[PDB]
Amino acid sequence: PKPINVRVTTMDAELEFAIQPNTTGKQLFDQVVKTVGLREVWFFGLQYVDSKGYSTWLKLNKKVTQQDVKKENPLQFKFRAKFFPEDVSEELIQEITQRLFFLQVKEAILNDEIYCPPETAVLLASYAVQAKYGDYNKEIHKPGYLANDRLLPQRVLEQHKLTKEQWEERIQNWHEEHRGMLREDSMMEYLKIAQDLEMYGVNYFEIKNKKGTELWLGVDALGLNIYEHDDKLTPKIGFPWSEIRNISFNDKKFVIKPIDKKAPDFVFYAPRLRINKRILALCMGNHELYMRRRKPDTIEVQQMKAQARVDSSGRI
């Protein structure tokens, strides 16, 4: 019963495991979390591409082989954060947990996946520049030190006009102001900014109405959103969790029935059945956590935030 090679990459690390015919998604995850030393697991998941090109999350409950993981030598997984909190500030408790979000969000912005205006960009870059190098000191940090650093989204490089140096000089100015800022805060401060971005935390899907117009259905922490195909930023129709009563689907048809019966029902169409199941999958997840975060803190969570207060407090 030969084992199946697997590669799981964290944000800043590569892990190589060996699975079997019937190793559940759970097992794999549980191990990755153990090997990485991550506790707040409810935020992550293993991501991958299916036989037919789409990205998606590994179902923990059904088996790893028993889902469309692209058939390639080491099965490729990305231990990447699945759900985003409503306020990065008081939901991400541990340094490590705080971390992987920072790095995950950074990449996304640098890859234009999460849009970002040039100013917000330069500021964000400055915070990372603070978190990587520490305090600006001129004696060591002379001009062009940010020469070899990836810092800004591409869209703000190609669509503008500064040289790389000028741009660098801006990050440079901001960098000077963030003095005496530990990397923990530098990182959190980054996220605080980023979470207010229009695209942050949104899962986009390709769909159509009944006519046949292209549309984007987004699933985020607060509910659903229907976007116009050319505007992935502004929702043309939002469906907060509390205004929806029940979400359902048949092969390619999806329906969003509003809690208000005087209101009509919404329906969009999905390319393949797999996408509708995946959309509903994410809706459970976020909603699930949307409630867990409006009820008292689990004891485990309590001692976490507690033990966390002592890890940044002081001494004598």
């Binding site: 509390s242 205004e243 009563r245 029940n246 359902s248 092969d251 509903l280």
Partner: peptide, 15 residues
């Protein structure tokens, strides 16, 4: 095989 599916949210059930 597996074709259909739904999740009841606001339904006075989950609070």
């Amino acid at each position: 095989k597996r074709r259909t599916g739904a999740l009841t949210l606001s339904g006075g059930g989950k609070r």
